[PDB]
Design a protein around this nucleic acid. Structure first.
Lengths: 129, 186, 149, 82, 82, 206
RNA sequence: UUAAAGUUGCUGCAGUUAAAAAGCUCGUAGUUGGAUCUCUCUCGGCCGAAGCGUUUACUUUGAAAAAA
């Protein structure tokens, strides 16, 4: 059964950047998907997306640029102290220059570069580059 | 005619109450308007020069305002200049309980008094004679949102001109930006 | 995918988006509740009352007209059964498998098919004991079940 | 392929799909309005209806149920609700 | 690609595909760079200037090169709308 | 034809299309080619849309015109229904024909006798002459193909939806491509019709 | 004895044919679980007490953590 809705909604948009498509449908949407998708959009990886409201649980249509190499989820959402963020962004990211780890801190779902400024730990949600 | 929760009248809704008062002596709404009363009224601007006044109704009387809505809009927009009127029920927003709170909520808040469930029940009776048939929220590049509300095709020609004032009153009393569509089909 | 079957089948109902009672329906909520009281005094389940109003009386969803659903109408008027609707139909089905089984001892099909009906009873009795719809000592015993239904 | 439009499917593309696989779930049924010829009444009947719908006045059949769609009897005409 | 001094540290800057933004590699010989002329507006003769499209080899091997060049010409206004 | 009324389809060209039967596709449809279809009638034959066909000729004629050297286009047919239509297209335009059998390695084996290096390939039937198609994908060749409904679009780049089975419908499509290449170039233009009859491009059965 | 050993594998292995998926199914414990909800009262000099709110996990700070 569907354990982890954010897992199936990222491998839906991973498998379509491979196949070269310009739009995905990702049903169902939670609001952790919309926060994660807005972080990818603000760093230019995705572009504009639309939340289709049926009364059940929304679907999202996401317009894709061709800029995303990989989009991933970490399961379980391990807890990440700020003194242990370097090991995580060395195991998961391709270089020191690009790519982001998304973690859910109490100040909001953010990057690892934002979470370093606001001095916050959290739980690792996933990564994109 | 005007029942405020704190008994604070104002010269805006006084004219609205006097306008409603002739409906118990000129029209066929004699038996309806004796039981009904409004609770607030607000005249606002939308569209750069155009004016529109919103009229607030208590909640358990709102369903009785629907059967006489389309007549009262005619009888009220006829009596003064072009000013669109819409009837929005008076729904209390209870705040989202944090980890620190007072000793009032020994019974919990109902989910009808939540900001999401009130910010779209406002939208249902804002646009009243046509009904919402779809909804699509779009998130733009800068992170802002833009709700696209679809409406009924069959009730188009009586509310097709109001759809700039709907956006303005939804911007003022909710904060969110909205656009209205009339789709061709399902 | 269905629980005790290998079939991954897709067949259900599709409720529409427009949640409002439509234009032509000339029944108020009090009239619908008055219909429901008579259809329950006739001895029908909540799953059968919603069918009769849909087919004949033109009511699409009783939750959309009355604001409340079927079972919370009957349990507030009082005309409601003690053990719930789906637990009854499993207990009544496990009687007829068990009753037929003493006639034909060699039937090793319905001996296997009894345990699936058995193992669905304890999945529901656990849920109803958790939500406190059943008392917390109710147990399905295979001998008393002819007087539970 | 590879550039469809998922926000705006065509109206024949919507009607081909499953009722749960559409962009928004739309039901495939309706409420008809059957008129028995031998009587003068109006009885609102679901399209995909189960066990039989009798008139209150003439007390005859209107539609016996089938697999999917309840078939009307002979002479029973209907005009679809909205 | 740049250091702090702003100078460009690259052998070359490769061209990406016009359909899918994939980098066309050095030894990707199934790739295309296609020129499509522009006509004069009033007489319909060859103006001199053209539009250029590049198609990566994986798209072209998929067979999606026909409907990519077409809908790239429809956005540049060479194919008439519908 | 980007909404230009000089390039729009005239009344005579549709009479030519319907008299040859270019609008009548096969009895199958590739999934790539469903964009160019109008509908399927009874007796199975798909009816090829003709406003779509005229826009793919004029896309392809822009592609041929945008090559400077007129003898860098290489014009290919292997079935004999397009072997007269190709020698006459290359005669009036200036291209280089390979009518008959395309021996493999024409574009790869630089030691060979028949080695040449085109800048654009025009083939006639991607089912039939697939061997110039797969060999183009080694040497970076864009590709026009006069495509039927059941003919697969791998390695083609702008495939004209015509009926490439009938002998008149192939010669007329080559005639239209020659006409539009010459008209969009500097030669004799759109006022008077082309005095080269389209029956020159047809296939002569003994 | 440690690395080499991604040949013990949490990171991070394998299981058609190389070693290997239980004959099949039910099932308690374990493990994992779909959408959804934007700080105030009695006192002291507006600023401190006292209470919280359903309880936690998480995260950040603090103080306490023998020397070598």
């Amino acid at each position: 059964v569907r354990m982890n809705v954010l897992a199936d909604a990222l491998k839906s948009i991973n498998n379509a950047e491979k196949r070269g498509k310009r739009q995905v449908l990702i049903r169902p949407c939670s609001k952790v998907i919309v926060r994660f998708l807005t972080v990818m959009m603000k760093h230019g990886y995705i572009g504009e997306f639309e939340i289709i409201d049926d009364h059940r649980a929304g679907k999202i249509v996401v317009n894709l640029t061709g800029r995303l190499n990989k989009c991933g989820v970490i399961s379980p959402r391990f807890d990440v102290q700020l003194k242990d963020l370097e090991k995580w962004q060395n195991n998961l990211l391709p270089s020191r220059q690009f790519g982001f780890i998304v973690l859910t801190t109490s100040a909001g779902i953010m990057d690892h570069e934002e979470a370093r400024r606001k001095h916050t730990g959290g739980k690792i949600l996933g990564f994109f580059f | 005619i005007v029942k405020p929760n704190g008994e604070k009248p104002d010269e805006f809704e006084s004219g609205i109450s006097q306008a409603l008062l002739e409906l118990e002596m000129n029209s066929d709404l004699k038996a309806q308007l004796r039981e009904l009363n409004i609770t607030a009224a607000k005249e606002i601007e939308v569209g750069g020069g155009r004016k529109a006044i919103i009229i607030f109704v208590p909640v358990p009387q709102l369903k009785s305002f629907q059967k006489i809505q389309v007549r009262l809009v005619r009888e009220l927009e006829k009596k003064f200049s072009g000013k669109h009127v819409v009837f929005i029920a008076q729904r209390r927003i209870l705040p989202k309980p944090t980890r620190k709170s007072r000793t009032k909520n020994k019974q919990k808040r109902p989910r009808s008094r939540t900001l999401t469930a009130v910010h779209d029940a406002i939208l249902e009776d804002l646009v009243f004679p046509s009904e919402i048939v779809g909804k699509r929220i779009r998130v733009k590049l800068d992170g802002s949102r833009l709700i696209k509300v679809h409406l009924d095709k069959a009730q188009q020609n009586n509310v097709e001109h109001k759809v700039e004032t709907f956006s303005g009153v939804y911007k003022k009393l909710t904060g969110k930006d909205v656009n209205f569509e009339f789709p061709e089909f399902q | 995918g269905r629980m005790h079957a290998p079939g991954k089948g897709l067949s259900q109902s599709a409720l529409p988006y427009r949640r409002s009672v439509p234009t032509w329906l000339k029944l108020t909520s009090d009239d619908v509740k008055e219909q429901i009281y008579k259809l329950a005094k006739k001895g029908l389940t909540p799953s059968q009352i919603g069918v009769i109003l849909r087919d004949s009386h033109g009511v699409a969803q009783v939750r959309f007209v009355t604001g409340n659903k079927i079972l919370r109408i009957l349990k507030s008027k009082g005309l409601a059964p003690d053990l719930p609707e789906d637990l009854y139909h499993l207990i009544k089905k496990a009687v007829a498998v068990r009753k037929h089984l003493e006639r034909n001892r060699k039937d090793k099909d319905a001996k296997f098919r009894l345990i699936l009906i058995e193992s669905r009873i304890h999945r529901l009795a656990r849920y109803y004991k958790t939500k406190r719809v059943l008392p917390p000592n109710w147990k399905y015993e295979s001998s008393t079940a002819s007087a539970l239904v | 392929p590879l550039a469809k439009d998922l926000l705006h499917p065509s109206p024949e593309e919507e009607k081909r799909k499953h009722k749960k696989k559409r962009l928004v779930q739309s039901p495939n049924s309706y409420f008809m309005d059957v008129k028995c010829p031998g009587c003068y009444k109006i009885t609102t009947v679901f399209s995909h209806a189960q066990t039989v719908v009798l008139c209150v006045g003439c007390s005859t059949v209107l539609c016996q149920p089938t697999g999917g769609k309840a078939r009307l009897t002979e002479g029973c005409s209907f005009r679809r609700k909205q | 690609m740049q250091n702090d001094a702003g100078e460009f540290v690259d052998l070359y800057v490769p061209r990406k595909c016009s359909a899918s933004n994939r980098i066309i590699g050095a030894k990707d010989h199934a790739s295309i760079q296609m020129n499509v002329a522009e006509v004069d507006k009033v007489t319909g003769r060859f103006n001199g200037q053209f539009k250029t499209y590049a198609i990566c080899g994986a798209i072209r091997r998929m067979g999606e090169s026909d409907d990519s060049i077409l809908r790239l010409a429809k956005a540049d206004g060479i194919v008439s709308k519908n | 034809s980007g909404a230009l009324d000089v390039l729009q389809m005239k009344e005579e060209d549709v009479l030519k299309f319907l008299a040859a039967g270019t609008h009548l596709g096969g009895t199958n449809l590739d999934f790539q080619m469903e964009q160019y279809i109008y509908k399927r009638k009874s007796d199975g034959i798909y009816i090829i849309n003709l406003k779509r066909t005229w826009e793919k000729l004029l896309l392809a004629a822009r592609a041929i015109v945008a090559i400077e050297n007129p003898a860098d286009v290489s014009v290919i047919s292997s079935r004999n229904t397009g072997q007269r239509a190709v020698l006459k297209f290359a005669a009036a335009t200036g291209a280089t024909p390979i009518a008959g059998r395309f021996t493999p390695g024409t574009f790869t084996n630089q030691i060979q006798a028949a080695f040449r290096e085109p800048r654009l390939l025009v083939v006639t039937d991607p089912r039939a002459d697939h061997q110039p198609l797969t060999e183009a994908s080694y040497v970076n060749l864009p590709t026009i193909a006069l495509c039927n409904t059941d003919s697969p679009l791998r390695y083609v780049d702008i495939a004209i939806p015509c009926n490439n089975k009938g002998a008149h419908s192939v010669g007329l499509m080559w005639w239209m491509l020659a006409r539009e290449v010459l008209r969009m170039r500097g030669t004799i233009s759109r006022e008077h019709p082309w005095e080269v009859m389209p029956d020159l491009y047809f296939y002569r059965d003994p």
